[PDB]
Amino acid sequence: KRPAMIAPGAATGRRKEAIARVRITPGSGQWKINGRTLEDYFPNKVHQQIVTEPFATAGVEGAYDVIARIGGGGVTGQAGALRLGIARALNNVDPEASRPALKKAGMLTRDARVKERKKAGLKKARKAPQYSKR
Amino acid sequence: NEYLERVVAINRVAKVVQGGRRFSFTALVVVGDGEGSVGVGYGKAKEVPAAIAKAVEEAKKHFF
Amino acid sequence: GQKINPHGFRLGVTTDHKTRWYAEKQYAELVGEDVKIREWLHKNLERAGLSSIEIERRSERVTIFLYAARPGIVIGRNGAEAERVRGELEKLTGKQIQLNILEVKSPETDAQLVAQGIAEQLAARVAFRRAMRKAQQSAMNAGALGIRIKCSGRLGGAEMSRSEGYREGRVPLHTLRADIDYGFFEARTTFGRIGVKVWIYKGDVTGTRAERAA
Amino acid sequence: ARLIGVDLPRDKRLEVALTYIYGIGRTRATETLKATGISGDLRVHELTDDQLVALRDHIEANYHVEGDLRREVAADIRRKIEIGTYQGRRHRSGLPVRGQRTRTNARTRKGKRKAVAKKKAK
Amino acid sequence: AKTALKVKAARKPKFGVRAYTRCQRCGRPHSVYRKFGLCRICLREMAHAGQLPGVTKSSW
Amino acid sequence: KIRIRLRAYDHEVIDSSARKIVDTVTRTGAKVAGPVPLPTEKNVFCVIRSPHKYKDSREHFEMRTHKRLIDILEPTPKTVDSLMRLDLPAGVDIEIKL
Amino acid sequence: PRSLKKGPFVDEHLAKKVTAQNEAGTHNVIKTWSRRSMVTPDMIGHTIGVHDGRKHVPVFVTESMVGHKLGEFAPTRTFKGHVK
Amino acid sequence: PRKGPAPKRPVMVDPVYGSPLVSQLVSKILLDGKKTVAQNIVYTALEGCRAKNNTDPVQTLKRALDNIKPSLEVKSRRVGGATYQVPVEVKPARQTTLAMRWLVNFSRERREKTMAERLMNEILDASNGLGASVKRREDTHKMAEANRAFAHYRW
RNA sequence: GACGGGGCCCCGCACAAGCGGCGGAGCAUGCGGAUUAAUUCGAUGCAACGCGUAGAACCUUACCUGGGUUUGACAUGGAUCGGGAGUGCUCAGAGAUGGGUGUGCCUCUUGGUCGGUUCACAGGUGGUGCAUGGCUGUCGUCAGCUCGUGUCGUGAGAUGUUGGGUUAAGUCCCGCAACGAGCGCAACCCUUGUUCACUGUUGCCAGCACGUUAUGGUGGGGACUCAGUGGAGACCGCCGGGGUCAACUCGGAGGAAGGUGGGGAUGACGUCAAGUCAUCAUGCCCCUUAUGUCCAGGGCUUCACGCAUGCUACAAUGGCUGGUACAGAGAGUGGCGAGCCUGUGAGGGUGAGCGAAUCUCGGAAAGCCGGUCUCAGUUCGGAUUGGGGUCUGCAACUCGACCUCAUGAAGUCGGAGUCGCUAGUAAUCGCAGAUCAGCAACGCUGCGGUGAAUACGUUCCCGGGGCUUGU
Ligand SMILES: CON(C)Cc1ccc(O)c2c1C[C@H]1C[C@H]3[C@H](N(C)C)C(O)=C(C(N)=O)C(=O)[C@@]3(O)C(O)=C1C2=O
Ligand SMILES: [Mg+2]
Ligand SMILES: [Mg+2]
Ligand SMILES: [Mg+2]
Ligand SMILES: [Mg+2]
Ligand SMILES: [Mg+2]
Ligand SMILES: [Mg+2]
Ligand SMILES: [Mg+2]
Ligand SMILES: [Mg+2]
Ligand SMILES: [Mg+2]
Ligand SMILES: [Mg+2]
Ligand SMILES: [Mg+2]
Ligand SMILES: [Mg+2]
Ligand SMILES: [Zn+2]
């Protein structure tokens, strides 16, 4: 019921071979990922929502700054890792007022979905060569 | 030795399976004392000596 | 036809490599000399009975552990045969060989020597069923938890090939923590050769290198 | 009859109307435009005769084009035929000359598949 | 492989480009690894038997 | 100061050798940086399992090289002699950069 | 084709034979297995029996041969057609 | 499958228009795995929709989907020595899927140049009540009515 | 036992529901056929056909023409004459080889090394995979296959292993003339998902001090990330319902992860006289101035055709062009090569650095953004063909890759039929490695990027499992 707490904090996020070092701090709510701003590093609204929505589902809103260092993976994987990092930071800052909703939204969870390895005799992880009877 | 025995007959029986046939050996033995007690034993095995021994030990307990 | 080598399957997990050296620019030539050493030793020391040849290297110096059932043949008289085989080893390789020969505590339990003996009997034309039963009985008298022997070929000098086998106890080939010793030999008969394979379940081993080699 | 022996198609950019000429490709047309100092992004129907003939003069002076290059290529092939090289023999046979495989397809030289009757199994 | 072929491969090949590898245990001319000599079959069997240090089955 | 590179194929013997080196140098004073693990070299070989005409079933092997690094901060010529004279297992090599 | 800065490749015995033929009269057939060699002006007007795998087929080298290899004029495969 | 009904992946909502319908539309366009290209197409089509009519593009997409939604469709049946076309009622999820698939396919089949406003034109026509998608819906309903006599074979 | 166009009960991308293909076109590649002096040999329904080949210009090479050789190209052992062997430069030759010329053992009075003459003998990718070993495919990750003892039956044989319930599972539970055990299932192993301790360079940079402006470049730091060792963690363990019960099953909480979490390794008894005498090994047979062996050239690359696996396409969800983001896994000293100069470019010339968490390969591409093309057999497609080149190599004619200039073929989404896939999958996007001087690699094995639709269901098609019935 309480509007959570502002408080600085930090965490790490990972998703699909991408690492996200997140440091959330009280502020105006601006972003800086690898130096460049959000609208530069995530140039399109395709997957800005996935990283912004941890705040939306938390009590705090876009009046709380964050600094992100992002490595590995592609754009979407980096987005997911950053989202998980922000969720974990909010978690360990306020594990009572934001923990229930934040976990219920399925956000304090790291999906282990990773590219399955290729297998001998198969064109891809599961694709098989075209069977030709006689 | 102590008890005199004869191997009456041996036969090669088989059981047909998906792979093929599972052969086996049957043994008739007659074991007696030579003085009035005698018995007959039937033995099943995968091998002739094992079938014979099983038949002999089964005949020991059938002495009349 | 479709079964993995037990030693290769358990390699690194429970059993260990027979060669212990590191080299990254000569690797192939050291492998070649190792092959030469092993082939020479196997071809010239059948009589002793070779469980394993273990090769180590420190710096241009090779060390050979020869695990043999009866090292009497290897040592000859007062080490004369040992000296001659060492000298042949320098002749073959060109490096300083330090050769030591070790016993096998239970040759009737080591699978490789068991295959050695079974193949020797088959070559000497002993009934294969009797030979397999003797080896099995001796292994369980020694105290192995499981024996499995398989002789494949023109058994008894016949025309068709058979794959006759014996086993009792437990031989869990699929279990990695299971310590399974595997041996193989070929009986050279007047009718080709017979392949004799032996699995012996020594027991169950844990980790840390099988308790760091127990 | 706009250029040497070909009519540039109207309503199409000059940089590709030039490539419509035999003996002129993309880079050849681009050079030609840079040498003549003529834009390449204007349609052909706005082309003054002075710049048109300047382009024609540059092309004629620098480049073998149209009938000249076609005759030269035919002469080269005929010379291969008459000298009797391996390539010439393949040319006469109407079969690939540059070491292409001929077991399976070679289709662009062998034409359409003229399937033939073969031996019949029992 | 043939013994003559094995010895010919072992000897210097006049021209440098004419050299080839051969399985140093087996004589096989196809699928010979530079890292450790040998060949496909020789590698498989020797790795199983454990004479190749560091080489173990991979199941990542 | 004074680099020691350890390379082998078994991380147990790597760790044992590194522990022996660090405990030796320390027994001779010389405080030394802890054994830092370098990334392991990972070579992969794929082999047709069958000797003939069976390519879809294959076997994969790896040769993993484990590397550790030691720094001998204290010069300590006595430790220099100790590190040149001690004995190490055959499977692991040593590289001393003075 | 061969690099220009390496020059044409003439098999260094065909060259010596054609030079000897030039010195002692350009009238003989020069038998060679050097399909590998490059035709040069110095041999123009000669006749060279180039091996084709089973026979030394003779070619009379003319002016236009020069930019070609000796083996281009000695076909190795015979086809004649499928069927008849 | 034999084991049972496999779980369904939850459908996400479009960040821009806040409707799962547009996300389903982009995931249905979604050729070659290019999500960004697909939703650029979809957003362009929706903006063209709101350009040509003042009403909301998500509402016009919804109206088109209701106009293309089939109520019942026939499936092949192997009763006897001849095949039957048994009409079966269509669940809401299945009919939304069918409407979206038909919309996308007929948009791809339209004659205009670019996919974005081929889809825009098809959406507007369907919302009005015209187009190939609506025609196919009517034809499937007509054939279901023709084969309505086999409504008793449902299991 | 097997089979059934017999039943009941089941399972698998087996259908269905979907998405993308193949079959049409061009090319790449394998094969059949034909051809040839030779087109070396093996593979032939699934389970042969981008398969042995993880690299055929010479070599490889096993084939063909021709030229050489005969204890032989190579081993091992006795004798016997020896001191050089072995080689540098030259000559003849297509080369093999032959002839010159230079150089010519270390011990020791009897060895290492070679020579012949022999003598033994070697050699064979010559035959037979139905003489074999080894290794492998395969049914089949299928849930099974058996044994000891007891018992039933004259006997083969049966029981266990049937039945009810359950499970991914002969997985367990209940009952039971069965009581037990073994190989399979599962687990132990590797990898991935969470976390802790330890260590801190070549990795990392939160707080501290400068740095040429600049680069964690610097002192330094154990925080974060990562590297790699050792631990923790998941067990239907907890809660509730169902299930007499009991196994199980449903729901929930906690949690990174919940009911096997994902993937790999692992392939029971056996089947197919399945593949391999050509990797190796080997029984027997065959060759021995030739079926051995050396060499040059040729062939394995042929082309009226047929099949198969792929690649590029047929365009606008696209082509072209400028700018601009985000990887992982790997390789490297005859190697990876930066930087600079030169050339349109392939490249060349110089040339640091790095045996490599350091240096190099390096650029990721798709994507985003701006411009442009405007549905045109095209600014689609890039086959073919003509010219000029580069590099590797003794040598690119047959028969290499690449660059550049020109040329601009079929192809408008493909007949009957057919294939793959249930989630980080399909679809697509690039990257790396093995072999390898170079490369016909679009193949193979991996790596990450983007990232779906659908599964009502078992009626039907294919394969299989338990029991039962008929023969
Ligand atoms: C011919 O000699 N007599 C008459 C008998 C025979 C004798 C010795 C043999 O060594 C083989 C054969 C029969 C063939 C048949 C082969 C055939 N295959 C080549 C297509 C086949 O149809 C299958 C198959 N589809 O399963 C096989 O079984 C097969 O491959 C095989 O094993 C064979 C042999 O090797
Ligand atoms: Mg080569
Ligand atoms: Mg279907
Ligand atoms: Mg086609
Ligand atoms: Mg062939
Ligand atoms: Mg053969
Ligand atoms: Mg056969
Ligand atoms: Mg066979
Ligand atoms: Mg055959
Ligand atoms: Mg298992
Ligand atoms: Mg042979
Ligand atoms: Mg071929
Ligand atoms: Mg599945
Ligand atoms: Zn080999």
From TrEMBL, chain B:
Residue ranges of domain S5 DRBM in the record: 3-64
Assembly: Part of the 30S ribosomal subunit. Contacts proteins S4 and S8.
Family, per entry: Belongs to the universal ribosomal protein uS5 family.
Function text: Located at the back of the 30S subunit body where it stabilizes the conformation of the head with respect to the body.
Domain notes: The N-terminal domain interacts with the head of the 30S subunit; the C-terminal domain interacts with the body and contacts protein S4. The interaction surface between S4 and S5 is involved in control of translational fidelity.
Name of the protein described by the UniProt record: Small ribosomal subunit protein uS5
Record organism: Cutibacterium acnes
Gene: rpsE
Covered range of the whole protein: 32 to 95 of 215
Automatic annotation (TrEMBL), chain E:
Statement: the UniProt record of this protein carries the keyword rRNA processing: no
Binding site for Zn(2+): C23, C26, C39, C42
Keyword list, A-Z: Metal-binding, Ribonucleoprotein, Ribosomal protein, RNA-binding, rRNA-binding, Zinc
GO CC, any one term: small ribosomal subunit
Family annotation (PROSITE patterns): RIBOSOMAL_S14
GO biological process: translation
Stored InterPro entries: Ribosomal_uS14, Ribosomal_uS14_bact, Ribosomal_uS14_CS, Ribosomal_uS14_sf
UniProt GO molecular function: rRNA binding; structural constituent of ribosome; zinc ion binding
Cofactor note: Binds 1 zinc ion per subunit.
Protein family: Belongs to the universal ribosomal protein uS14 family. Zinc-binding uS14 subfamily.
UniProt-recorded name of the protein: Small ribosomal subunit protein uS14
Organism: Cutibacterium acnes (Propionibacterium acnes)
Automatic annotation (TrEMBL), chain G:
Pfam families: Ribosomal_S19
GO biological process, one term: translation
The keyword Electron transport is assigned to this record: no
Single GO MF descriptor: rRNA binding
Keyword Magnesium belongs to the record: no
Swiss-Prot/TrEMBL keywords: Ribonucleoprotein, Ribosomal protein, RNA-binding, rRNA-binding
GO CC annotations on file: cytoplasm; small ribosomal subunit
InterPro entries: Ribosomal_uS19, Ribosomal_uS19_bac-type, Ribosomal_uS19_CS, Ribosomal_uS19_SF
Family statement drawn from the similarity comment of this UniProt entry: Belongs to the universal ribosomal protein uS19 family.
Chain's role: Protein S19 forms a complex with S13 that binds strongly to the 16S ribosomal RNA.
Protein known as: Small ribosomal subunit protein uS19
Organism expressing this protein natively: Cutibacterium acnes
Gene that this polypeptide is encoded by: rpsS
Automatic annotation (TrEMBL), chain H:
InterPro entries: Ribosomal_uS7, Ribosomal_uS7_bac/org-type, Ribosomal_uS7_CS, Ribosomal_uS7_dom, Ribosomal_uS7_dom_sf
Small ribosomal subunit protein uS7 domain segment(s): 1-148
Residues annotated as signal peptide: none
Keyword list, A-Z: Ribonucleoprotein, Ribosomal protein, RNA-binding, rRNA-binding, tRNA-binding
Complexes and interactors: Part of the 30S ribosomal subunit. Contacts proteins S9 and S11.
Function: One of the primary rRNA binding proteins, it binds directly to 16S rRNA where it nucleates assembly of the head domain of the 30S subunit. Is located at the subunit interface close to the decoding center, probably blocks exit of the E-site tRNA.
UniProt family annotation: Belongs to the universal ribosomal protein uS7 family.
NCBIfam families in alphabetical order: rpsG_bact
Protein's name in the database: Small ribosomal subunit protein uS7
Organism in which the protein naturally occurs: Cutibacterium acnes (Propionibacterium acnes)
Lineage of the organism: Bacteria, Bacillati, Actinomycetota, Actinomycetes, Propionibacteriales
Gene field: rpsG
